[PDB]
Amino acid sequence: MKLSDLISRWIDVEPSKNAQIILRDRYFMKDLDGNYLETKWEDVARRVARVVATAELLNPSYKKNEKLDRIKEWEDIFFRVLKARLFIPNSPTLFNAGLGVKHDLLWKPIDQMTLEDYEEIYRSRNHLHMLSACFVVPVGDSIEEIFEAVKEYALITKVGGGVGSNFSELRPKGSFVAGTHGKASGPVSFMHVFNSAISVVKQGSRRRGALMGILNINHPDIEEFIDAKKVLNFFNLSVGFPMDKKEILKLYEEDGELELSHPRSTIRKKVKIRELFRKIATNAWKSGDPGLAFLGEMNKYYPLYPHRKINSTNPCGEIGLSDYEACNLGSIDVAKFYNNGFVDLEALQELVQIAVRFLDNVIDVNVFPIDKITKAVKESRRLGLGIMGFADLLYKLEIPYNSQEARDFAANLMAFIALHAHRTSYELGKEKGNFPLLEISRYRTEDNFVPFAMGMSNYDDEIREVMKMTKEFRRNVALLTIAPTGSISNIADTSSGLEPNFLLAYTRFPLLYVNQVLREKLNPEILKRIEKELIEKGSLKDIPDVPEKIKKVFVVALDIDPMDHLLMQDAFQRYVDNNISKTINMPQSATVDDVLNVYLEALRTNVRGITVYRDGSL
Amino acid sequence: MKLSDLISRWIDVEPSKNAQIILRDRYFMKDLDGNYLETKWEDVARRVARVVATAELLNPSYKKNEKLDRIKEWEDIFFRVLKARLFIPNSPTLFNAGLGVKHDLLWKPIDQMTLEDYEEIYRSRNHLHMLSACFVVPVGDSIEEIFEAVKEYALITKVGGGVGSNFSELRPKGSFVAGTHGKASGPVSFMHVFNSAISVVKQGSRRRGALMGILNINHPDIEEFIDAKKVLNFFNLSVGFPMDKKEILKLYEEDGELELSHPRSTIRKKVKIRELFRKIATNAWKSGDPGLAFLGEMNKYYPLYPHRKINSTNPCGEIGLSDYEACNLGSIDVAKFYNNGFVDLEALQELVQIAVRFLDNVIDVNVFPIDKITKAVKESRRLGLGIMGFADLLYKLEIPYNSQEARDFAANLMAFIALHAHRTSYELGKEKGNFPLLEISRYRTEDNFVPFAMGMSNYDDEIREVMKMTKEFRRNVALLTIAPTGSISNIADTSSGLEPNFLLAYTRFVTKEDGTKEPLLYVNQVLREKLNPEILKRIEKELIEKGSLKDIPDVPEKIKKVFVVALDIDPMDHLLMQDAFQRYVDNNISKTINMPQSATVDDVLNVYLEALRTNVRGITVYRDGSL
């Protein structure tokens, strides 16, 4: 079906009461005195679409004389997709689009818009007009650099961004400090200062700080780092693996030793890699931190490596970013593309093309707090297009999430999306200009460069042809992710990212969500029976009656075993150029060795990082 | 006697074994491998003298034909006074002088020095060559300004400076934040972040962070602030009074109210000033914090006010500084100037002269971490010349510290030092050029401006004359302080600043090798010389135990009266001695008002009230046994 007719299906479906509370609470724009300027999701869609359409003012392919018609056409299509909740950008785009701009321009009817109105919108965006969720900044090994970075953390946090750093440049605890003849405090002690700073800075009532701290497996303070969260309450922590995954897997299998060293310390030490891994797995088993960051695997597929390098991810791991790089995200609700036993690929291809342009346009109307970041974004134009609604889509297609069928479907769907996103990046490079760094990237300097592993779809040959075409034109260094969608999936009334539903019926903090696909499928009588027990047991697994069929389709996170979580992550990652947010859920009864086995399988798969969470742990 | 004759008396006297421990521990320079580059006090005096003499390269009054000779001469006199421990600069001058300079230049015989050698010393001073103890920075009401200040605190602490700020620009807790539609954390919450930063920064083993935080009495978060230290372990805290001390005393006497308010907040509150005072006194009675900072009184005597403004002190209260301003200090051991019943003013006047040139030269070879600081110091050239050994001097003169005799003597001594310091600033402005802001200062734009209150000396008229002469030539905006001298008085083997001796005797502990802790027994040297050694051996047990001579049987009354220690002296007598010095000091004064364990909160309040009537610029109290 044509997208415009899909839009018609969804556009007047009202957000749920629960989603409306969330919107009122933090997304509807208020004036300085606290009065609402927006009361409905329609108003947000209008505002955001108009602001992001103003980027077309910069399009060199439009004659000054045609610009108004073209801008209005993009506003209209952005508005309709957004109102329908077929695609939603990351929260900061929703919170901050239009800041600075006269209230009489942000919601005015589109048929009244003049070229001067759009110019005024573009000009009046203020210093807070920050629309991107993901940031990385370096923390160099000096007091100047550490405290400049603390300042950057605070500035990013204030405007609503999530920021990560690799702390491995900081010399280990005890190291000589030539300047004072002293002993260095080490990275962990400094991370405490970053945490203290972020305890007092937030985006008001809308968004607290969210941080990632990485320390590399071979740093002399790695053991202290691994136990650091056992304070650092604003940080997620992951262990960094800058080397090849294969090299580290081989070391483990051969029971080898890892040399812990640092370039500006005499502190050296040897540790058995198996012991280090067990220490990680033990802490993860207890508390869920730290995760693993396969930085080597990110750089393997980074088109600008090795003249730029990925040293860190943002807070939830989904984008690997070079120093001072930021990235804006957005997600398609693929559950809205179910049509009579199939995914409507006709309409999906159309939305992927719109979505890529929208995310690319956000770069042009985004304002960052630090010039180095503005520069890094402009040079690379990395985007993060992903999906949400995946688990609910599988429910509609009657596919169990824990099955090879599901995984082959996921690979093929992600492959389709990736083909069309990259084809769109080609078209935009031809239309608007290539990203500045194309010439020095592997898209240009190499043949047969592909930014992901592939191997699980018949789209692969077509994907290879497109990548060859982008030697010539390419708007964006990379285009895809799967994010947590912790808030936007709630706004869209759909499942989160690629995750299975955690529960089919449950209350969040008033009350209560109950899976609509299940409500629409399960016998409405055999439903009011079981319901009490389902909220009690948290699954259908051993409720009797309840058809087995409904049971096998309507699985939740803890019905699905750790390896089936992991292999789902791999199926998607083979067709994602950035990374993926995935929690490997594990039963309360899992052991430390069960965790280690997830790590070893992860090292063989194509995953770029790992997060585990053992039920009942925290 | 001539200063050269006094120098002869002291120059070959080495520091006590006690002082030598401190020096080896943190004053003797080491190479990157840790090997000692210095092993005698002599070696430190050579290095510092040579570095600071290097500033004479910039003296525009010298012809290059004499320049080597002139430089070598100041290096020589600097070396002799430092070696003798007659004058010693603040610790950071001693720790950092010569950093960046090739080791072959800092200690080689002076007769091997060429003008190329001095030029190279000047050129190779590195970014850690920081020679000043006292800093103030602003903390403006924005996330950007707050975290820029946090960084500044880390950079200053790294190089071994002590820093203060007034945090009153920060809007009170719960105030609107327009950029986020949020609520402000308030100053105290931010001060916790500064403390956290400084928990991980220090000048190696030499020196931990030392911070001052001031909040003004009409800030709406003042009550929270007053109780904040009852965490902030690197902060001293003082309450700021930017208004006239008289205005505050009058509000108190009338039992009036203060309106608390802030320019970036809508909430205002009225509080009884007596209630606020009792809150301060109760916390100080418990813990020693917060102090009082009479900012208004400091600005009363600030020659650049209101063009520039003192909003805060450094950590120990002794220098009131404008934003980004710093100040280098040094102190004269006046105990060494006793001669046969009198102070040797002949030799003291010559040393004042040398010392003011030394301190002014430090500015020229000092490297700061932040350009705005370099600028502020260059524009003002503020110095902090003070004294140590004062308590020991009184013992030698057989004057009780707790007496009008002592306070009269103090005022006269400080009046004399002030006279000849400001005279040498005149001579220096003529030789080297005036401080850039002389023009806009009250030394030019008024008649009869004097940067301190006077009123307790024969010298007042001559001081008035010197200040008039200084309308024309003046190298320095201000010259004088009395610091704590917590380390340099140890190196000099003398009493600390203007403070009385805390104890006349205690057990010192020496690391033996083998094991222990060899207990030695320290008795005050002047007491050792006056007291019959038979008696001393008899009473010293009891003297260590009781921490005073006062109730020891068969110690002569004259000895009891003269050899007083801090807790023998009542709080009013502490306070009035502070007033006597402050009348002839252009910056402020470090003084602890010691209070007996038996003092009440009412007794603390009465100290604060008497302080409002005297000429003191701030108050620190410590009640024995409170912490």
Ligand SMILES: Cc1cn([C@H]2C[C@H](O)[C@@H](COP(=O)(O)OP(=O)(O)OP(=O)(O)O)O2)c(=O)[nH]c1=O
């Ligand atoms: C000064 C100082 C540094 N450090 C750590 C911070 C950085 O990780 C590292 C170096 O900081 P720096 O600020 O670089 O110290 P430096 O340049 O004077 O010494 P070097 O030439 O040997 O670099 O030392 C502390 O932990 N505490 C300190 O007091």
Ligand SMILES: Cc1cn([C@H]2C[C@H](O)[C@@H](COP(=O)(O)OP(=O)(O)OP(=O)(O)O)O2)c(=O)[nH]c1=O
């Ligand atoms: C952003 C933010 C500010 N503050 C405090 C820091 C400053 O004392 C004060 C101002 O911060 P600013 O950084 O100046 O906030 P703003 O400029 O966006 O808003 P305004 O125009 O109202 O200044 O608020 C917090 O306590 N928490 C915060 O998250």
Ligand SMILES: Nc1nc2c(ncn2[C@@H]2O[C@H](COP(=O)(O)OP(=O)(O)O)[C@@H](O)[C@H]2O)c(=O)[nH]1
């Ligand atoms: N500062 C801050 N950033 C967050 C927070 N939650 C998410 N982010 C950022 O947004 C990214 C994507 O998270 P996602 O859950 O998809 O956000 P949504 O767009 O709000 O649904 C994270 O990886 C962070 O970079 C938060 O609470 N605070």
Ligand SMILES: Nc1nc2c(ncn2[C@@H]2O[C@H](COP(=O)(O)OP(=O)(O)O)[C@@H](O)[C@H]2O)c(=O)[nH]1
């Ligand atoms: N950073 C830091 N500064 C100090 C310390 N002790 C003193 N200061 C600074 O030195 C100034 C004068 O102190 P003083 O005790 O006379 O120092 P001394 O020269 O070491 O004897 C204080 O007022 C502070 O500003 C310390 O331990 N750390």
Ligand SMILES: [Mg+2]
């Ligand atoms: Mg360094």
Ligand SMILES: [Mg+2]
């Ligand atoms: Mg502001």
